[PDB]
C-alpha cells in the first residue's frame with residue numbers, strides 16, 4: 125500500500141530512535157537522515173489510517189502559490205494554522221490592551237481558565253484582521269513565509285525574485301535541467317525568525333515525460349507534521365505538472381531530524397494497529413492551466429476513505 | 441566494507457538508470473533521489489578501489505574554510521581544479537591577446553593542436569596570477585564560491601554573514617539544535633552563475649555526543665565527482681567535531697540527480713570488478729583546535745592502500 129513508508133517511518137523511529145531533548149522541552153525520539161519514496165502515479169498519498177484535513181492543505185497551498193503572506197486568506201477559508209504567529213505579534217505590541225497572554229500557547233495546556241480567554245481573544249484578533257483592513261495590513265501579514273520565499277525573494281538590490289515562477293517556466297523550456305530548485309532558506313532571515321522553514325528546499329526533475337519532486341525537510345513532527353507535508357508537496361507536484369503538460373512521477377521526502385515527541389508515543393502505536401485502505405485519487409480541473417489561478421474548487425479528492433482522526437497534544 | 445554504498449550506487453545506476461541527456465551534450469544514465477550512509481567511526485571513506493587524490497581534497501577544503509575565493513591559494517598548492525573558471529574569465533576579457541580559446545575545454549578533446557596551446561596559455565595565466573599581484577586580484581578571484589557562501593554571505597544591506605562560523609558556535613552552545621544549516625544556494629546568484637553549487641546545502645546534528653552531517657547534492661558525476669565529495673565533506677565532519685570536542689558520527693549523502701555519463705560506462709564496470717580493502721584512518725593534529733587555522737600539515741591519512749587510478753574523459 126502507498127502510505128506504507130510513513131508507517132514504516134514511524135515504526136522505525138520507535139525502534140532505532142534515540143532519545144533527544146529539543147527546543148520545546150518535550151522529549152523526542154530521533155533518527156537523522158531518512159528518505160522515503162512515493163510513486164504519485166498509484167494514488168494520492170493522503171493517509172488513510174488517520175483522518176487528515178485535506179481541505180486545510182488545499183487552502184494553505186494556494187495561499188503560498190499566490191505569493192501571499194497575510195492571514196486573512198486562510199481566515200476567509202476557515203484555516204487557523206498560522207494564527208498564533210500573527211496573534212503573538214499582536215500581543216507583544218502596543219495596542220494589545222487585554223489580559224495576560226505571555227506564553228499563551230504553552231499555558232493553554234494547563235490552563236487556570238486561560239484556555240477560554242485565549243480562545244476568545246483569538247476570536248477578537250482574527251475578526252478584526254478579517255474586517256479592520258488597516259489592522260489586517262498590520263497584524264495579519266506574517267511577512268517572511270513560504271509564499272514570499274517562493275514567490276517574492278527580496279534581493280540585495282531591493283527587488284523581488286519569483287523563484288517558483290521561474291522554476292515552472294524553466295521546466296517548460298529546459299525539462300532536463302539539474303538546477304530546478306526553489307529555496308526557502310535565507311542565511312540572513314533565519315537568525316531572527318520565529319520558526320525558520322522546516323520545508324527547507326525542493327527540487328524538480330523531469331524524465332520519460334514524468335515530473336518528480338524531492339523535498340528536503342530539516343525537522344519533522346512524524347505524527348502531527350509529516351502527514352500534512354506529504355499531501356502539501358505531493359499536491360504541488362500534481363499541480364505543477366498539469367501546468368506543464370507533464371505526467372506525474374514521484375514525491376521524495378528527505379529528512380534531517382525526523383522525530384516523535386514523547387507525548388505522542390501512545391497515539392502512534394495506535395495508528396500502527398490500523399491497516400491502510402486504498403488511497404484517494406486527486407482530480408484537477410482540466411480547463412484551468414495556470415496553477416497560480418487555481419481556486420479551492422479546482423482540486424478534487426475522489427474516494428478518500430479514512431480511519432477516524434487520532435488526537436494528540438501540540439508542543440508549540 | 442565502508443565504501444560499499446558508492447559501489448552499490450554505481451551498480452544501481454547502471455541497472456535502474458534511465459537514459460537522459462544533459463547540458464554538456466553527453467548522454468547520462470540517471471536516478472533521481474538517493475541517499476547513502478557512511479559511519480565515519482569505522483574508517484575514513486576515501487575509496488580504495490580507485491586512487492583518489494586526497495591531497496587535492498585537503499587543500500581545496502582549507503581554501504573554503506578560509507572564506508577564500510582566489511585561485512592563488514590552490515596554485516600555491518598544486519591544485520588546478522578551479523583553473524578553467526578563472527582562465528575562462530581571462531580569455532573573454534580585453535587583455536587576453538593570444539590565440540583562439542573559445543570553447544577551449546571542449547575542443548581540447550579533439551584538438552587540431554589546441555591541447556598544447558591551451559595547456560601552455562594556462563601556464564602563462566596561472567603564473568601571472570601566482571606572481572602579478574594585480575593580475576591575481578583581477579582574474580584569480582572567482583568571486584562567488586563555496587568559501588564566500590559559507591563564510592561571507594552578502595546580505596541585502598551590504599554586509600557579510602559567516603554562516604559556517606556561526607553554525608560551529610551554535611553547535612557548541614546548542615548541540616541539539618535542528619537548524620544547524622549552511623546554505624550554498626542563493627536565488628539571486630545562480631541565475632547568472634557559471635556553475636550553481638552542486639553541494640547545495642548541509643546540515644549538522646548532534647546526539648549521544650556524536651556529530652553528523654547530511655549533504656544535499658542536486659547533481660553528481662558518480663564516477664568523477666561523487667568520490668571527491670565524499671572525502672571533502674567526510675573530512676569537514678571530522679574537523680568540525682575536533683573543534684567541538686565531539687565524537688564522529690555519520691556522513692549522509694542525499695542526491696538529486698545522481699548520474700553516470702555514457703563515456704564513463706566502461707571505466708565504471710572496471711571499478712566494480714575490484715574488491716575494496718581496508719579504509720584509511722584520518723589523523724587530526726591534537727594541538728590545533730580552531731579548524732579555520734588548520735594548515736595542510738595538520739591532517740594526516742594513515743594506511744591508504746588503493747587500487748591504481750582509473751582515467752576517464754571529462755564532459756565540461
Ligand SMILES: C#CCN(Cc1ccc2[nH]c(N)nc(=O)c2c1)c1ccc(C(=O)N[C@@H](CCC(=O)O)C(=O)O)cc1
Pocket residue numbers: 175176177184205345347348349350352353356433438439440
Ligand atoms: C503543512 C503543514 C504542517 N503544519 C505546520 C507545523 C508548524 C509547526 C509545528 N510545530 C510542532 N511542534 N509540530 C508540528 O507538527 C508543527 C507543524 C501543521 C500545522 C498545523 C497542524 C494542526 O493544527 N493540526 C491539527 C490536526 C491535524 C491532524 O493531525 O489531523 C489540529 O487542528 O489539531 C498540523 C500541521
Ligand SMILES: C#CCN(Cc1ccc2[nH]c(N)nc(=O)c2c1)c1ccc(C(=O)N[C@@H](CCC(=O)O)C(=O)O)cc1
Pocket residue numbers: 491492493500521661663664665666668669672749754755756
Ligand atoms: C570536490 C570536488 C569535485 N570536483 C568538482 C566538479 C566540478 C564540475 C564537474 N563537472 C563535471 N562534468 N563532472 C564533474 O565530476 C565535476 C566535478 C572535482 C573537480 C575536479 C576533478 C578532477 O579534475 N579530476 C581529476 C581526477 C580525479 C580522480 O577521479 O581520481 C583529474 O585531474 O583528472 C574531480 C572532481
Ligand SMILES: O=c1ccn([C@H]2C[C@H](O)[C@@H](COP(=O)(O)O)O2)c(=O)[nH]1
Pocket residue numbers: 146147319320322323342343344345346348349350352353617618619
Ligand atoms: O511539516 C511540518 C512543518 C513544521 N514542523 C515542525 C518541526 C518541529 O517539530 C517544529 C520546529 O522545531 P525546530 O525544527 O525549529 O527546532 O515544527 C513539522 O513537524 N512538520
Ligand SMILES: O=c1ccn([C@H]2C[C@H](O)[C@@H](COP(=O)(O)O)O2)c(=O)[nH]1
Pocket residue numbers: 301302303462463635636638639658659660661662664665666668669
Ligand atoms: O562533487 C561534485 C561537484 C560538481 N559536479 C558536477 C555535477 C554535474 O556533472 C556538473 C554540473 O552540471 P549541472 O548540474 O549544473 O547541470 O558538475 C559533480 O559531478 N560532483
